Amino acid sequence: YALMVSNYLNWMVRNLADMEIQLGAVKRIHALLKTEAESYEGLLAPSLIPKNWPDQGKIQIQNLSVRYDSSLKPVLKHVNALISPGQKIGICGRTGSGKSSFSLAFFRMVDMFEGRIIIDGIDIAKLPLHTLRSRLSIILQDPVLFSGTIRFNLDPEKKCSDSTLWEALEIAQLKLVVKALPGGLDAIITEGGENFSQGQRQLFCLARAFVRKTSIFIMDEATASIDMATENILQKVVMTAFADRTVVTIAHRVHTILSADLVMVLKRGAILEFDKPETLLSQKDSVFASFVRA
Amino acid sequence: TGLKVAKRLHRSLLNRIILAPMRFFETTPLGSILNRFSSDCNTIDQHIPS
Amino acid sequence: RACTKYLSSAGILLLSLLVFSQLLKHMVLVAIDYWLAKWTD
Amino acid sequence: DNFCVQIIGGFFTWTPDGIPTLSNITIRIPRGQLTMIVGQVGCGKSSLLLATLGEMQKVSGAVFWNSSRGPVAYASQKPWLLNATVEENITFESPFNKQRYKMVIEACSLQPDIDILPHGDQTQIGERGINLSGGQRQRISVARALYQQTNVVFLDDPFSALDVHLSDHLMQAGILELLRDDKRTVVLVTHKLQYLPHADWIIAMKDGTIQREGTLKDFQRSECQLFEHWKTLMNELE
Ligand SMILES: Nc1ncnc2c1ncn2[C@@H]1O[C@H](COP(=O)(O)OP(=O)(O)OP(=O)(O)O)[C@@H](O)[C@H]1O
Ligand SMILES: Nc1ncnc2c1ncn2[C@@H]1O[C@H](COP(=O)(O)OP(=O)(O)O)[C@@H](O)[C@H]1O
Ligand SMILES: [Mg+2]
Ligand SMILES: [Mg+2]
Numbered sequence A: 001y002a003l004m005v006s007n008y009l010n011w012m013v014r015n016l017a018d019m020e021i022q023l024g025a026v027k028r029i030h031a032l033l034k035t036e037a038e039s040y041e042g043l044l045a046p047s048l049i050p051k052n053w054p055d056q057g058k059i060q061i062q063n064l065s066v067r068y069d070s071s072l073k074p075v076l077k078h079v080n081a082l083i084s085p086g087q088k089i090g091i092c093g094r095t096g097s098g099k100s101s102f103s104l105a106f107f108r109m110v111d112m113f114e115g116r117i118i119i120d121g122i123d124i125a126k127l128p129l130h131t132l133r134s135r136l137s138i139i140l141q142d143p144v145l146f147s148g149t150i151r152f153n154l155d156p157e158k159k160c161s162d163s164t165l166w167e168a169l170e171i172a173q174l175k176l177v178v179k180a181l182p183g184g185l186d187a188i189i190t191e192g193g194e195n196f197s198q199g200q201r202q203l204f205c206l207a208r209a210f211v212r213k214t215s216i217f218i219m220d221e222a223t224a225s226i227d228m229a230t231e232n233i234l235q236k237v238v239m240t241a242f243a244d245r246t247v248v249t250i251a252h253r254v255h256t257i258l259s260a261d262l263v264m265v266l267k268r269g270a271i272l273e274f275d276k277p278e279t280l281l282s283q284k285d286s287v288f289a290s291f292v293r294a
Numbered sequence B: 001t002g003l004k005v006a007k008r009l010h011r012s013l014l015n016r017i018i019l020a021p022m023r024f025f026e027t028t029p030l031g032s033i034l035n036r037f038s039s040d041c042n043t044i045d046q047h048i049p050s
Numbered sequence C: 001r002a003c004t005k006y007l008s009s010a011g012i013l014l015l016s017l018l019v020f021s022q023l024l025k026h027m028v029l030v031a032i033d034y035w036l037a038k039w040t041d
Numbered sequence D: 001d002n003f004c005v006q007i008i009g010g011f012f013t014w015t016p017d018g019i020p021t022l023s024n025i026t027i028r029i030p031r032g033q034l035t036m037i038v039g040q041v042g043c044g045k046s047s048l049l050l051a052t053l054g055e056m057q058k059v060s061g062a063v064f065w066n067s068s069r070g071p072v073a074y075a076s077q078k079p080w081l082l083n084a085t086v087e088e089n090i091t092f093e094s095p096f097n098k099q100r101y102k103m104v105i106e107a108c109s110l111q112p113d114i115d116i117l118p119h120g121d122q123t124q125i126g127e128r129g130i131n132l133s134g135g136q137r138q139r140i141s142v143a144r145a146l147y148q149q150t151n152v153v154f155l156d157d158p159f160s161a162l163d164v165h166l167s168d169h170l171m172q173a174g175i176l177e178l179l180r181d182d183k184r185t186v187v188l189v190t191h192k193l194q195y196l197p198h199a200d201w202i203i204a205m206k207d208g209t210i211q212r213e214g215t216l217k218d219f220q221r222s223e224c225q226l227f228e229h230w231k232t233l234m235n236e237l238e
Helices: A002-033 A099-105 A129-134 A150-154 A162-171 A175-180 A198-212 A228-241 A287-293 B002-018 B022-027 B030-047 C005-010 C012-040 D045-052 D086-091 D098-108 D134-147 D164-179 D193-198 D224-233
Strands: A059-067 A079-083 A088-092 A111-119 A136-139 A216-220 A246-250 A262-267 A270-275 D003-013 D022-030 D034-039 D057-065 D073-075 D152-156 D185-189 D201-205 D210-214
Touching: A002 B002, A002 B030, A002 C005, A059 A099, A079 A270, A088 A099, A099 A216, A099 A246, A129 A136, A136 A198, A150 A162, A150 A198, A162 A175, A162 A198, A162 A228, A198 A228, A228 D224, A262 A287, A270 A287, B002 B030, B002 C005, C005 C012, D003 D045, D022 D045, D022 D185, D022 D201, D022 D210, D034 D045, D034 D164, D034 D193, D045 D057, D045 D152, D045 D185, D045 D201, D073 D134, D086 D098, D086 D134, D098 D134, D098 D164, D134 D152, D134 D164, D164 D185, D164 D193, D193 D224
Parallel strands: A088 A246, A088 A262, A136 A216, A216 A246, D034 D185, D034 D201, D073 D152, D152 D185
Antiparallel strands: A059 A079, A059 A111, A262 A270, D003 D022, D003 D057, D201 D210
16 A cells, blocks of 8 residues: 555645646636626516517607716717607717617617617517517628528528528528529528628628518618618618618618608717708708718 | 536536626627637536546 | 535535545455455465 | 739639639739729629739739739738737837827827727737727728838728718828828729729729729720719719
8 A cells, every 4th residue: 555655646646736727617617607697587577568569660769878887988878769660760970979879779788777768668678688689670780690501691590481581682682692602592601701792791691680570670880891882772672671660770871861761960979960851951050961961 | 427517517608608798798808708618618528527 | 616616516416425435435445455464364 | 014913814713613703804003003993792802802912712814913922011801900909900010110100090090099998009909808899990900001111002991880081081191191102002992982083093893803994084985884873873073
């Protein structure tokens, strides 16, 4: 047994140091395991939520002021607006005016420390996050694609048929491009969509939102990576295909929202102007007229 | 013991990450989150039971 | 805490079975060597 | 001679043995001038930019450099940021030259951004650093491209993440003033057609080929349809 001490004292000390290093990895996993979670429960009862709680698409915004964290500056200050169902709302302003946080406010991705967003008579703070975020579609400015087929990127849960996917691709000007690929809807999108262009990746994300077929679409500078020629026909076919649906279009180019029903001009997180573009362009001193003229 | 802890810790980590807010994902670098699945999980699955 | 996550994930029954079985196996080996020492005399 | 890059009959493929993504590429980029590549989505613009750089496999044709390509200041369409600071990303392995650094900061209008962040001009950027807005990533990449003393600048959609004022100030103070005074070759892929009057040379692309290559006076007679189409998009293009 003394020879075993001579062989195993070193092995015991080595395994103790190793076990300390392994418990470091367990410690890092537990430290990541104690991170806070979003409140997915929701105060409103699931029976009180109808089967299609965006029944028509009415949006009321009452004294909304949002921020991203506690002890941080509110990126929106006293936002108050009404959106009748079926109305098209163009949102314009300079970069940094809180108009993407406005789009994120409908999905509760920002800290709404005061104010309410009532959609069809239901406050969205009372609702579960999956319930809120499943009945609304958003198109971010930056495309996010995943590895897999085109069918997997448009419909990962396989809840829609091939005709719906082809309508979504045809609206997003990708019928000919996807049909030219030999797989078709089974054509492989690489990690981050590197086998497609930036505009084609963004059109894939637009078609990804067109599959869902909700009542409220929020297009947050979707056509920034798209050329003007195909942007105009894409805007026209989105307006015709979603004529009965409330669309909140955030304009990378202001001339795209000249045909909108109402235009929300944001200045430094405050709605300076919220009116029809025909009356808004009639005023010479209006900021929206300076956006269109320059 | 190694199989049980290796299953349960990855299940808990994967379920707790997807419920964390986007403020956490923007603040924390993705390497710090991903290395728990890559290296620390590899230690717990393989190196720790040995 | 964070260092004790492995013990809580293992559970009391599995961890105590591991410790008890290892201790009993090594004391059985000690008993075998002691009985061999008594036998050789 | 008087040109920077030239391609004669260039067939280039992304895939090793697939259909050529570029066909019959014939470009004559002038040196010290602004060349603008314009076209629709997925028509070969970034592919042409990377076919001159040798990043894409060539099937046929010839590529000539009269600058043996040498360095080319490149701002990719997806902005690439190192794990270092704002200043190290803009400088990008170059001597500091604070007088030029202030001009590059003001041309990209990055001065209000470095008046925020916990350590302005020294905050770590990218992975393991603070997350930026997409416009800020775009402007730091463009500031890296504008800062260097490279004869050739390649810009691939620098105005995608920016609004009207930032793009106009970057076009005027950065491209038309900072780059022109150095007599620098600028090749600018853009979807903003309002800057076509500021272009010395225009390369129009269509389905991975050169549709028409010339000045705006050339497009007024050679391609009447595309000229009028451009005029319809932006509401006599002199
Ligand atoms: N890295 C790549 N690998 C394979 N195919 C690619 C790659 N990049 C582009 N392609 C394909 O080659 C064609 C040309 O794309 P390209 O990169 O030239 O786009 P682009 O004209 O710059 O796009 P946009 O203006 O929409 O950003 C497209 O049909 C695209 O699918
Ligand atoms: N993830 C974030 N965390 C903290 N603050 C943010 C975040 N995203 C944006 N902001 C803040 O919001 C302001 C810009 O609002 P934003 O909606 O991004 O404007 P725009 O829509 O014009 O890009 C910035 O001053 C920035 O500080
Ligand atoms: Mg934005
Ligand atoms: Mg490109």
